[PDB]
Design a protein around this ligand. Structure first.
Ligand SMILES: COC(=O)c1c(Cc2ccc(C(=O)N[C@@H]3[C@@H]4C[C@@H]5C[C@H]3C[C@@](N)(C5)C4)cc2)c(=O)c2cccnc2n1-c1ccccc1
Lengths: 9, 318
């Protein structure tokens, strides 16, 4: 539940 | 008047005025790609100028296919068509096709080597599977899925970039010239997920020949039961190769590498299967524990002359 909303590039 | 020109390296982009500040982000053999700001949608887009679409029979055929497929597919985990245009005013002068597309932030190469938790690992794979399932429903089987044609955004969204064929990540049935089915793409997803964990290409074959070696070296020789499916001229070479016994998946992907874990290992051992008839399917992969956490039903469910291709393509553009 609650999918990630940030990814680190 | 509606168009203006900007030089991008040796290429001249002549585009609708809505597209401003073109900067190149990459190039393929299909053509050159710029990010632009679209003033009318108030967001950045990708603009692709097609490389000599009517150069010959192969270009035209491939330009036409891309145009037709983009127009039919529509899904949040697949790069979408926004616009298509040409600056030329008649079929006679028709030279250039521009395809305007959604723009993401990076390809998967630069995210794959970094340290990913299970939640971001699993949710990117879920989105990848959603995009793949939709492609398959439209009768499109990719076969060329790799980190460089999967793209991601800083919000952890993911899109599949294109439609593939029609060599590190390619399935056995493809490098052996066999038939393939839908779950040929599951192999590639396994190779990618396997890469997300080990931190490096699983089967970095220096050549097609070294490629099958590295596969069977890691995974073992395929059973009878596959050779029997092999065409004679290749059935023999494959058969002549030295017998390689396989490691285990605990051996290939040990606990030392994970931040679940035992789960990503199970799914992997179900995707990275040489014999496709034992390889898991997209629908099963989706509902598999390591993946099913994100589930949402609305996301997860001829020859011609060059002039004739040019006419067909022109219709698509107009
Ligand atoms: C390498 O390109 C891709 O992986 C790539 C990305 C990710 C990305 C998107 C944008 C950038 C990028 O360099 N962005 C920069 C930021 C944001 C704006 C555009 C430029 C320059 C800027 N100043 C403004 C900073 C990098 C990767 C797409 O979203 C993409 C979307 C549609 C078509 N092709 C795409 N390609 C690509 C693939 C193969 C060949 C040519 C293009």
């Amino acid at each position: 539940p609650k999918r990630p909303t940030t990814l680190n590039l | 008047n509606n168009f203006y020109s900007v030089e991008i390296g040796d290429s001249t982009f002549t585009v609708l005025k809505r597209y401003q500040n073109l900067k190149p982000i990459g190039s393929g053999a299909q053509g050159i790609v710029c990010a632009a700001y679209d003033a009318i949608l108030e967001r950045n887009v990708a603009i692709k100028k097609l490389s000599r679409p009517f150069q010959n029979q192969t270009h035209a055929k491939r330009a036409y296919r891309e145009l037709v497929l983009m127009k039919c597919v529509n899904h949040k985990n697949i790069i979408g068509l926004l616009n298509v245009f040409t600056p030329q005013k008649s079929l006679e002068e028709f030279q250039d096709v521009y395809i305007v597309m959604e723009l993401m932030d990076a390809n998967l190469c630069q995210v794959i080597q970094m340290e990913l938790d299970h939640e971001r690992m699993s949710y990117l794979l879920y989105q990848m599977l959603c995009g793949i399932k939709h492609l398959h429903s439209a009768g499109i089987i990719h076969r060329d899925l790799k980190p460089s044609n999967i793209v991601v955004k800083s919000d952890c969204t993911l899109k599949i970039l294109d439609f593939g064929l029609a060599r590190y990540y390619r399935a056995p049935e493809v490098i052996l010239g066999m038939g393939y089915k839908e779950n040929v793409d599951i192999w590639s997803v396994g190779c990618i997920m396997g890469e997300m964990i080990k931190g490096g290409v699983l089967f970095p074959g220096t050549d097609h020949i070294d490629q099958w070696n590295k596969v069977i070296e890691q995974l073992g020789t395929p059973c009878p039961e596959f050779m029997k499916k092999l065409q004679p001229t290749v059935r023999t070479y494959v058969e002549n190769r030295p017998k390689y016994a396989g490691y285990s998946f605990e051996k290939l992907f040990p606990d030392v590498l994970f931040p679940k874990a035992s789960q990503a290992r199970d799914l992997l051992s179900k995707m990275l299967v040489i014999d496709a008839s034992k390889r898991i399917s997209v629908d099963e992969a989706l509902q598999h524990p390591y993946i099913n956490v994100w589930y949402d039903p609305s996301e997860a469910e001829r020859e011609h002359t060059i002039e004739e291709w040019k006419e067909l393509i022109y219709k698509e553009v107009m």
